[PDB]
Amino acid sequence: MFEVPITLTNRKFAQRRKLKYQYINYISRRFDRISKKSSDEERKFWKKYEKPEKSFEIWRTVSSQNKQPINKQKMTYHNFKKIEKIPLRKMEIPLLHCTKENKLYFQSISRGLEPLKTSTSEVRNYRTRHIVTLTDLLHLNVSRHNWSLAYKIFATLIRIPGVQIKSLWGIGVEILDNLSNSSSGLDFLQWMCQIYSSKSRFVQNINYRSIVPPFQTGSRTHTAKFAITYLWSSLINCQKSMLIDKISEWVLTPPFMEDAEVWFIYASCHLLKADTLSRQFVNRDIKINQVIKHIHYVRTFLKICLDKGGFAVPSRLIENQLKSFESRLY
Amino acid sequence: TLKYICAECSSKLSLSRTDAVRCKDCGHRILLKARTKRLVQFEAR
Amino acid sequence: VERKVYPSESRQRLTSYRGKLLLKLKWSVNNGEENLFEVRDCGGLPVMLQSNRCHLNKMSPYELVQHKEESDEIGGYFIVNGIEKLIRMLIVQRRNHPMAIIRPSFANRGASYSHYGIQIRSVRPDQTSQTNVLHYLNDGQVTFRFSWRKNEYLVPVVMILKALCHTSDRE
Amino acid sequence: LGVGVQGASLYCPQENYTTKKQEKPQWLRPVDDTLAEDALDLHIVVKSLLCDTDAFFWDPTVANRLDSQYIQTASDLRNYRDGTEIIAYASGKTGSVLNLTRQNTLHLNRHNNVTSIELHSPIKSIKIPGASESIGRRSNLVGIITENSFQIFRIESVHSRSCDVMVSSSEPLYFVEIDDLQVVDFAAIIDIKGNWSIGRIPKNFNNLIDNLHGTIFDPEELSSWKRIEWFSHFQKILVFDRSKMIEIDFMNNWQTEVVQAKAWSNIRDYKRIDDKNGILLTSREIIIVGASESNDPVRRISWKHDLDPDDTTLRITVQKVKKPDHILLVAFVYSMRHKRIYMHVFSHRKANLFQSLGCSTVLEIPGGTPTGIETILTLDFELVVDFLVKLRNSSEVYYYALSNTVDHPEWASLFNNADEREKESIGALVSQIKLKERERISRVQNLIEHENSHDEDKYLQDLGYRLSIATNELLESWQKTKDESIHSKLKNLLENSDSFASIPEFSSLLDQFFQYYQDQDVTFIGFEKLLHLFLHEDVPGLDIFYNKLLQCWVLVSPQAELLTKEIVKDIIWSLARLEKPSLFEPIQNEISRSLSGPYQDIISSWDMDD
Amino acid sequence: FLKSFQFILKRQIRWLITEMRFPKEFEHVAKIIWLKILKTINDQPQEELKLQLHMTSTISILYLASTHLSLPVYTCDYIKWICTAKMPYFQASEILPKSWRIQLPNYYVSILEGSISPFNGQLYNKIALTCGMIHFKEFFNSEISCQGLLLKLVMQCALPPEFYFYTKQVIEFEETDIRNLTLWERTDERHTGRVSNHAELRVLSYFMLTINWMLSFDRDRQYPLKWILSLTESLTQRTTTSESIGRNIVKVVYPDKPTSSDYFQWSEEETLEFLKWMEKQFLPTDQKIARRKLYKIFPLDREANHDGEFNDSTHQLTFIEDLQERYAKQTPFFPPARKEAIGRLLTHIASQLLVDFAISKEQLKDCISRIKNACLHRMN
C-alpha cells in the first residue's frame, strides 16, 4: 500500500515508459502540423515543461495575466483517429521488437486503461520483499500511534541497504514522540541538514529516478524541507525550554538569499527575545536598549521577508505585538 | 607497530598503501606521527 | 559534509585561513524590464582572526584552549599560507578638514604657480578617499586639482562653483 | 489567519512538524501550528447489510454503480414535507438496470419495492449533483451516464402510503459525435474525452447543448479519465485530466491553468465538498483541501497533507461533520487493488483556520476490493461517522458506522461429479475403508490384550534372528561386488514388523542389534539424534518421543492409543535406511570420479579450506 | 565459478552437519553427487560449454542427498530454511569467498548471489534436470518417506490421525510399485512434465482428496458439522510458534500468491519475533563516518532496557504445545450448510500447501486432475 524507499528498476519498466515517450514525441509534433493547417526521446520530452522543484505540481496564481479566452473549435472522433494514425503507423515496427506485454501495455494504455499492476509488487527480489514489508509495517504503527514498535521497524529499515531519504527524515515524529531515551528528533534533523547540504543547481533536464525535490532534496533556489523543519522545531523547542542566542547565531550564518520563510524565522527568533526580556522584573540603562535592538531586528527582517516572494504574514498583527513590547517598556 | 595519531580526535591509526591520509573515525586530513620505544642517549648536562 | 574549520588547522596544513566570498549580481537589460540575480562564488578571501568572520569570535579562554589556541589568543592578523601577516597601520591626513599648506613642490607643477594651496582629503562613507587641492596662481587665478585613475586634472574653480548650484556672481 | 503560506500553495504534511507559528504570547499554548492537539481517535466498524442484487488493466471511464442522498421532491414544496432519503443502484446482467428510509440505521423500507427502470446500455456512472443552501431547497433530479446515450431522471412525489417512488425521465440523447463522455455535474453539463459543453435541462417530460463550449484537449495526456465540477456558484467550472486542472468561467471568455501535474504526481480524484468554500482534491503523493477565496472565488489553496501510498487507482470520499464551534472534514481515500481505507482529520474555524490532526487506517471484508464508498449525510468530543462501501467482485452493499468509542467456488468446482452410477463407485472406497480400519483397530487390540509376555519375548527373539542373518545375508553380497567403481531397503522380511507390541523394547532391541556389528561394511544412522524433525524441539530419545505424542492425541481419537502406537511403530520402519556400509565405501567412490575428470577439475574439487 | 559454487555448498552442509544435526554421513555421500555432477559438464565441449548451474542447483543436490538417506526432511523445509536465511542461500556471494567475488563477472555472480526465491516449480525442475545429468537410480534409493510426510501434514492441521491411515491406504489404491515413490529424472524434453510426476507433489494431491472423500459422503456421521466449525476456525488462528513465524516469512517472499499481505493482521507480539528474526537478517544481509553517526542516534536494540537478560520464564511456546491447544480446541466428538463448509476448509489448507512448496495455483490445479482422473480409471 504505502510508498517504498527503493531505487527499483526493471527492463520491462524501462522499456514501457520509453515505448510510451517515444510515441508521445511523434503525436505531439503531429498535433502541431494540424495546428499548422489550422534523441533520448524522454529527455527531449521534458524540455516542454518546467519541473516545479518547490511543490509537486506547478501551481500558479490565477487572477492575473496568465488567463486565456476559451478556444472555440473542439475535437471529434473523425479528426482524432486521423491525427493519431500516422504516429500509430511508425510505432508498430518497434512494437514487434519490444516484449509482447510491453506491447500489450502500449496497446492497452492508448485506449484508456491505465495499468492495474503496481510496479513494486512483482519485483520479487527478496530484499525488496522485506523493504515493502517493513514500510507497510512502518506506517501502520505510526497510523496506530504505536511508537516503541514503529521505532523498532524504523531502526531496522535504515540498516537494510538501498533505502532512501523518503523513509529517513519524514517520520522523525518517532524520536520526538517517544520521549524515553530520546534525541527528540532535533539531533536527527541536524544529521539530515549536515550531510545533505547541497547548494548545487537543479539541472532540470535529466529524468529523475528515486529522488523527488519537494520533500527530500535541497538544491539551490529550494530550501530543503528538513532544513526548515530544523528551523521551526528548534525555535519551538527553545521556547519550551523556558539558547535562543545559539539558534540566532546559526540562522545568521546561512543567509538563504532565495526565500522568505527563513527570514520570517529569523525575524521570529528576535521577537521571542523581545517578548521574554519585556517584563523588566522591577515592579537599567542596558535593559532598555537591548530590547530596542531586537525590536529593530524584527522590523527589518520582516521587511526583507515581505520584499521576497510568496510568504504572506499577518504584517499588521505583528506590529501590534511589537508596539505592545514597547508600551511595557515605555 | 608503526602508527600515527589523528590530529583532531587523538585516535591511533596506521596507514600502509592505497590508504588515504585521513582519520578513520573523523575525517581529519592531518596526521601526526607517534613516538615508539626507541633508544636515544643524552648526557645529563 | 561541511565541517567547521579552525585556524589551528590552517597553521598545521600551512594553508590560508579563508572564508568564502559571495557576491550577487544584477544583470539588468533594457533598464529593468528583465533582471537576473545570481549569487556568484568569488573565491576565498582570508579572514582576520577573532573577528566576526572567525570561529573564535565569542569564545571563552577555556574554549580557546580546547580549540588548540592560547587562552588569551589575541587575533588581529591573517593566516596566509600558514604565515601570520597583518596590515600595517599608516598615518594619513585627517579627513574632511581643509589644510592651508605651503609646499615648494606646488611651484614645480608649472610656471605662475605659487607655493600656496588648500588641501582637503574627503572620504566617502565607504571609507574611499579623495584628495582635492586648490592651487593659487601668481595671476590671481585659482585652480582645482584632482586625480582620477592616476592622472592629474586641473579645472578653474569658478567652473565648479558655477556647476555645483545655481549662482549669481554676487553669491 | 496563520502565517506559513506560499500564497500559491499551503502545506501541513506527513508528520514533518508544520511550517508556521504566530508566537501569540498569551500563556495559552503560545503557538498556533497547523498541527492541532487532542487525544487519539480509534474507529470501530458496525457491520450490517443494506441491500443486494486482461485483468492487468482497469477501465477509468467506469465510475460508480450506486448513490445515496436525501432528496426533496416537487410536492414537498407546497406541503410541509422536507427531505426523503433514496438509494439508486445498477442491476441486471451487464450492469443495466437502475432502481429507503432510516429507522435508526439506514435500511430498506417496508414495501421494499425495486423501481426497475430498464435500459439497453452499460451503466458507468450514477450520481446526483447534491444541493445548495443558498438555493434553500434540494434537487429532485438525477443524471446517469452510459455507453450509448446520456440520461436524466426526475424524481416526482415520493410516496409515503405505499413506499413507492414513481420516476420520470428525459430524452436520452445519443451520440452525434462518436466519443465516450465521462463525468456529469450540475451544482447535461458533461465532459467528453477531450472537450466539454453545457447542456440544458427542460421542465417538460411530455413530448440540449447551448451555444457555448470549450475544450482542454492535450496531445500528450493518454488516459481516458476526465472530470468536471462547478466552482463557488459564480458559474465557474473546473475541468480535469490526469495532468492539469483548468479553471474556466464561461460567463466571460476566461480560461486559466491552475494545477499542472505532469512532473512527479497525477490528479486521481476530485470530490466537491458540500461546503461552498472548501473542496478537497486527491493528487498522487499529496491530499489537497484547496478551498475558495473570498476576494476572487478562484482557488484558496489550503492546508494540504502529504499522503504516503503510491498507487494508480485511488479514489476519495469526504464527510463533513458540523460542530457548533468548528467544522471537521474527514477524508477517506480507497483503492481498487487492496482492501484498505486511509483517513485524515481536518478542522476549520471562522478565520480560514484550516488545521490537521492525524491519520489512521482500518481494513475491510476479505472477499474482494472496494470500488464504491459513500457517506450518508446524517440529516445535516466522541466523533461518530457512518457510510456504505461496495466491494469489487461481489454485488453486495453493506452499511458501516464508525464511532470514537475466504471460500472460493473454484475448489468447489473441482469435485462433486453429477455421475450417480459413479457416485457410490467413488463412494465404495469410503465404505471400503470402513472395513480395513476396523480390522486394524482390533488386531493390534489383540496385542493390547497381551502385556510384555514371554510368548512375545519369544516373538522378538525371533525378530532379531531374521534381522541378524538377513543382515549377514545382505552384507555378504556387497563385499564381493565392492569393486564396482562406477542404500538398501530393510523391508526384505514381510513376515514380522507388524505385530510387535513394545516401543521401549524394540528401541533397545535395535540398540541390542546395533552393538552386535563391531565389524566392517556395516554402520548406521542414529534415530534419537534425528527424530526431532516432527516436533521441532530437542528430542534426544525414542521413548520420550512417544511421550510427546502420548499427551498429544488424547481427545481426538477413540481410545487414542494403538493408533498413536502404530505410527511410532511405523516411523522407525519408515526410515528403513540402516544399511550403510563402513566409511570405506563412499571414500573409495570419491577417488574414482576425480580420476575420470580431467586435470582441470583437480583444482576445482577442494573442500575443507578455512 | 565452479570452485566457488562448491564453496557455498560446504557452508550449507557444515551448517547441516552442525546445527540441524544431519550427521557426518552426509558430506561423504553428498560429495559423490557433487563429484559426479561435474562430469556431465566434463563431456560438454570446453569451447562454449554453457553449463547450467544456479542457486536452485545447490539446494537440489542438497535434497537428492537427503532423499537418499530416507530423511524426514522435505522440500517444504528446504524452502522454509532459506526464507528464514538459516543456511547461506541468499547473498552467499558476499562474505564467503572474499577474493573470488572481486574477479568474477557480474552476470557470473548475479546468478551466484541468490536474489529471487525458487518459484513456480523452479526447485522441482532443477531436481529433475540434475537427475537427468547424473542418474539417481541403481546407486541411490528414490524412496520418499511418505509416512513422515503425511505425519508432517497430519501435524500441520491437527486433524484426527485416522486420515493418516486413510491416505496411506489411498496411495496404495493408485500407485505403481505401491511403496518407493518415484523421483523423476528428465533428459528427453526441455518441457515440463504435465502429468506432474514429482512424487512429493503427487502426495500433495493424495492429501487434498482423502480429506474430501471422507467428509463429503458423511455416512457414519462420525465427524459432525459443529466440529467442522471448531476445526476450520481452529486453523484460522494467528499464533506465535517457532514454525508459524518462519511460515510468516514465506508469505513475505512470494507476492504472486494470495495472503502475501497477512502482515497487516499481525499482533504486537507477532511483529516482535519477526523483528528479532530481522536481527538474523542483518548479519547475512570515507562516507562510513556518516552512517556510523546515524546508527549512533538509532541504536539497533531498544535504546534502554532490552529483553535479553532479565526477561521472563517463557515467552516462546513450541510446536508440541500449540497442538495441545489445538487438540483441546476441537472437543465436539459425539445439507447445504455442509457443502459450503466443505470447500471452506479445503481451500484454507490448500493455501498453506501452495505457500510451503513454492508452486503456483495452476501447478496444483494441474495435479488434481492428473490424480483424480486416474482413480476413476480404476473403477470404470
Give backbone dihedrals phi and psi of D85, rounded to 5 degrees, phi first. -100, 130
Based on the fold, state whether residues A114 and A14 are members of the same structural domain: yes
CB contact under 8 A, E330 and D555: yes
Nearest-CA neighbor of C49 among C23, C12, C3, C87? C87
Strand partners, D138: D131
Based on the fold, state whether residues A102 and A145 are members of the same structural domain: no
Nearest-CA neighbor of A59 among D4, D301, D238? D301
Based on the fold, state whether residues A175 and A248 are members of the same structural domain: yes
Contact D51, D371 (CB under 8 A): no
Place of cell 519524514: A170
Q: How far apart are CA B27 and CA B10, in angstroms?
A: 12
Neighbours of E192 (CB within 10 A): 17
Domain with A318, as residue range(s), is 125-327
Nearest-CA neighbor of E283 among E86, E118, E97? E86
Q: Kindly give, in sequence order, each residue whose CB lies less than 8 Å from that of residue A54, ignoring residues fewer than 6 positions away.
A: A213, A214, A222, D6, D9
**All 3 cell numbers of residue C42?**
568569488
Place of cell 469435485: D415
Task: Show the beta-strand stretches assigned E in E201-350.
Answer: none
Given A59, A89, A124, the domain boundary residue is: A124
Nearest-CA neighbor of D255 among C31, A70, A254? A70
Q: How far apart are CA A305 and CA E53, in angstroms?
A: 67
Burial class (CB in 10 A: 0-12, 13-18, 19+), C100: exposed
A104 touches chain E (CB under 8 A): no
CB contact under 8 A, E300 and A156: yes
Q: How far apart are CA D158 and CA D167, in angstroms?
A: 9
For D149, the enclosing helix (H) or strand (E) is strand D149-155
Place of cell 517515444: A22
Contact A22, A98 (CB under 8 A): no
**All 3 cell numbers of residue D12?**
501541513
What does the DSSP 8-state code read for residue D305? B
Place of cell 498507487: D311
Q: Kindly give, in sequence order, each residue whose CB lies less than 8 Å from that of residue A247, ignoring residues fewer than 6 positions away.
A: A231, A234, A235, A238, A269
Find the angle CA(E87)-CA(E93)-CA(E97) to the nearest 5 degrees.
100
Q: Which of E102, E286, E291, E296 to mutate to test the interface with B (most CBs of B within 10 A)?
A: E286
Contact A40, A17 (CB under 8 A): no
Q: How far does CA E194 lie from the centroid of its chain?
A: 21
A28 touches chain D (CB under 8 A): yes
Looking only at the bridges linking them, the beta strands covering D254-260 and D244-249 are antiparallel
Q: How far apart are CA C37 and CA C35, in angstroms?
A: 7
Based on the fold, state whether residues A111 and A164 are members of the same structural domain: no
Touch of E by D (3+ CB pairs closer than 8 Å)? yes
DSSP secondary structure, A255-292, as one string: --TT-SHHHHHHHHHHHHHHHHSTT-S---HHHHHHHH
Give backbone dihedrals phi and psi of C57, rounded to 5 degrees, phi first. -65, -70
For A38, the enclosing helix (H) or strand (E) is none
Place of cell 514503529: A150
Neighbours of D246 (CB within 10 A): 22
Q: Where does D321-396 have alpha helices with state H? A: none
Q: How far apart are CA D246 and CA D238, in angstroms?
A: 6
Q: How far apart are CA D215 and CA D192, in angstroms?
A: 9
Q: How far apart are CA D186 and CA D184, in angstroms?
A: 7
Nearest-CA neighbor of A8 among A210, A213, A216, A215? A210
Instruction: Output helix, strand, coil percentages for chain A, rounded to the nearest 5.
Output: 55, 0, 45
> Domain for residue A245, yes or no?
yes
> Domain for residue A21, yes or no?
yes
Angle between the N-to-C axes of helices D562-574 and E162-173, in degrees from 0 to 180, rounded to the nearest 10: 50
Contact D335, D311 (CB under 8 A): yes
Based on the fold, state whether residues A112 and A249 are members of the same structural domain: no
Q: How far apart are CA D237 and CA D185, in angstroms?
A: 10
Spell out which residues of chain C touch residue A194, defining contact as CB-CB under 8 Å: 1-2
End-to-end CA distance of chain B: 33
Q: How far apart are CA D301 and CA D303, in angstroms?
A: 7
Cα A171 to Cα A32, D346, D607, E302: the distances in Å are: 46, 20, 49, 18
A218 touches chain D (CB under 8 A): no
**All 3 cell numbers of residue E12?**
550449507
Q: Report the residue of chain B nearest E291, measured CA to CA.
A: B25
**All 3 cell numbers of residue A124?**
520479487
DSSP secondary structure, E336-353, as one string: HHHHHTTHHHHHHHHHHH
Q: How far apart are CA D461 and CA D502, in angstroms?
A: 13
**Using only C-alpha atoms, what is the Rg of chain D?**
39
Find the angle CA(D205)-CA(D211)-CA(D215) to the nearest 5 degrees.
110
Given A99, A124, A149, the domain boundary residue is: A124
CB contact under 8 A, A56 and D263: yes
E287: three-class secondary structure by DSSP? coil
Q: How far apart are CA D553 and CA C101, in angstroms?
A: 125
Place of cell 520418499: E144
Q: How far apart are CA A150 and CA A153, in angstroms?
A: 5
Cα E376 to Cα B37, E173, E210, E328, E373: the distances in Å are: 92, 11, 14, 37, 6
Contacting B residues, span 1-40, partner chain C, CB-CB under 8 Å: 7-8, 27, 29-30
Based on the fold, state whether residues A136 and A238 are members of the same structural domain: yes
Based on the fold, state whether residues A225 and A117 are members of the same structural domain: no
- Chain breaks of chain A after residues with C–N above 2.5 Å: 38, 242, 283
**All 3 cell numbers of residue A220?**
539551490
Helix and strand numbers, DSSP H then E, in chain C: 4, 11
Neighbours of C136 (CB within 10 A): 16
> Domain for residue A46, yes or no?
no
Based on the fold, state whether residues A137 and A272 are members of the same structural domain: yes
E133 touches chain D (CB under 8 A): no
Cα A263 to Cα A266, A298, C39, C85: the distances in Å are: 5, 10, 17, 37
Spell out which residues of chain D touch residue E147, defining contact as CB-CB under 8 Å: 567, 570-571, 574
> Domain for residue A218, yes or no?
yes
Touch of B by E (3+ CB pairs closer than 8 Å)? yes
Chains that touch D (3 or more CB pairs under 8 A): A, E
Based on the fold, state whether residues A100 and A145 are members of the same structural domain: no
> Domain for residue A285, yes or no?
yes
Q: Kindly give, in sequence order, each residue whose CB lies less than 8 Å from that of residue A209, ignoring residues fewer than 6 positions away.
A: A7, A9
Q: How far apart are CA E109 and CA E55, in angstroms?
A: 11
| Total of domains in chain A | 2
Q: Kindly give, in sequence order, each residue whose CB lies less than 8 Å from that of residue D216, ignoring residues fewer than 6 positions away.
A: D194, D195, D196, D226, D239, D241, D244, D246
The answer to whether the Cα torsion of E130, E134, E135, E141 is positive or negative is negative
End-to-end CA distance of chain D: 72
The answer to whether the Cα torsion of D158, D161, D163, D169 is positive or negative is negative
> Domain for residue A102, yes or no?
yes
Q: Kindly give, in sequence order, each residue whose CB lies less than 8 Å from that of residue C119, ignoring residues fewer than 6 positions away.
A: C93, C98, C99, C101, C131, C132, C133, C134
Give backbone dihedrals phi and psi of A153, rounded to 5 degrees, phi first. -70, -35
CB contact under 8 A, C12 and B30: yes
Based on the fold, state whether residues A259 and A233 are members of the same structural domain: yes
Amino acid letter, A298: V
Calculate how close chain C gets to B3, using CA atoms only, in Å: 19
B21: three-class secondary structure by DSSP? coil
| Total of domains in chain B | 1
Q: How far apart are CA D40 and CA D569, in angstroms?
A: 59
D105: three-class secondary structure by DSSP? coil
Nearest-CA neighbor of A292 among A307, A270, A262? A270
Given A124, A150, A181, the domain boundary residue is: A124
Q: Report the residue of chain C nearest A192, measured CA to CA.
A: C1
Nearest-CA neighbor of D338 among D315, D319, D354, D304? D315
Strand partners, D143: D127, D152
Looking up residue B44, the CATH number of its domain turns out to be 2.20.28.30
Contact E303, A180 (CB under 8 A): yes
Q: How far apart are CA A311 and CA A304, in angstroms?
A: 11
Place of cell 443552501: D133
The answer to whether the Cα torsion of E328, E333, E336, E340 is positive or negative is positive
**All 3 cell numbers of residue E243?**
514454525
D288: three-class secondary structure by DSSP? strand
**All 3 cell numbers of residue B32?**
601526526
Task: Show the beta-strand stretches assigned E in chain E.
Answer: none
Looking only at the bridges linking them, the beta strands covering D355-360 and D267-271 are unpaired
Contact D583, D524 (CB under 8 A): no
A10 touches chain E (CB under 8 A): no
Contact A126, E91 (CB under 8 A): no
Q: How far apart are CA D97 and CA D208, in angstroms?
A: 25
Q: Kindly give, in sequence order, each residue whose CB lies less than 8 Å from that of residue A280, ignoring residues fewer than 6 positions away.
A: A287, A328, A329
Contact A174, A154 (CB under 8 A): yes
Q: Dmax over Cα atoms in chain C, in whole Å?
A: 73
CB contact under 8 A, D213 and A74: yes
Q: How far apart are CA A230 and CA C126, in angstroms?
A: 37
Based on the fold, state whether residues A86 and A212 are members of the same structural domain: no
Q: Kindly give, in sequence order, each residue whose CB lies less than 8 Å from that of residue A126, ignoring residues fewer than 6 positions away.
A: E90, E114, E115, E116, E117, E253
Give backbone dihedrals phi and psi of D253, rounded to 5 degrees, phi first. -100, 100
Q: How far apart are CA A276 and CA A296, in angstroms?
A: 15
Which residue numbers of B belong to the known binding site for Zn(2+)?
6, 9, 23, 26
Strand partners, C48: C78
Count Cβ neighbours within 10 Å for each residue of E147-171 and write b for 16 or more, e otherwise. Answer: bbbbbbbbbbbbbbbbbbbbbebbb
- Closest partner CB to D536 (pick from E28, E243, E342): E243
D246: three-class secondary structure by DSSP? strand
Q: How far apart are CA D85 and CA D76, in angstroms?
A: 13
Domain with B5, as residue range(s), is 1-45
- Chain breaks of chain E after residues with C–N above 2.5 Å: 285, 334
Q: How far apart are CA D225 and CA D269, in angstroms?
A: 10
Helix and strand numbers, DSSP H then E, in chain A: 15, 2
Nearest-CA neighbor of A141 among A159, A158, A153, A130? A153
Q: How far apart are CA D544 and CA D54, in angstroms?
A: 57
Give the length of chain D.
610
- Chain breaks of chain D after residues with C–N above 2.5 Å: 53, 99, 187, 207, 380, 405, 486
**All 3 cell numbers of residue A158?**
535504515
Q: How far apart are CA A204 and CA A185, in angstroms?
A: 32
Place of cell 508600551: A327
Q: How far does CA E200 lie from the centroid of its chain?
A: 11
Q: Kindly give, in sequence order, each residue whose CB lies less than 8 Å from that of residue A145, ignoring residues fewer than 6 positions away.
A: D40, D358
Contact D57, A116 (CB under 8 A): yes
The answer to whether the Cα torsion of C95, C99, C102, C107 is positive or negative is positive
CB contact under 8 A, C2 and A197: yes
Phi/psi-derived region of residue D585, left when phi > 0, alpha when psi is between -120 and 50, beta in every other case:
alpha
Contact C124, C118 (CB under 8 A): no
**All 3 cell numbers of residue D490?**
530393510
Q: What is the dihedral of CA D548, D552, D558, D560, to 10 degrees?
A: 10
Find the angle CA(D505)-CA(E143)-CA(E83) to the nearest 5 degrees.
100
| D/E interface, count of CB pairs below 8 Å | 187
Looking only at the bridges linking them, the beta strands covering D190-191 and D314-322 are unpaired
Q: How far apart are CA A58 and CA B1, in angstroms?
A: 62
Q: What is the dihedral of CA E354, E358, E359, E361, to 10 degrees?
A: 40
Helix and strand numbers, DSSP H then E, in chain D: 8, 31
**Using only C-alpha atoms, what is the Rg of chain E?**
23
- Closest partner CB to A113 (pick from D9, D57, D217): D57
Based on the fold, state whether residues A102 and A135 are members of the same structural domain: no
Q: How far apart are CA D187 and CA D128, in angstroms?
A: 9
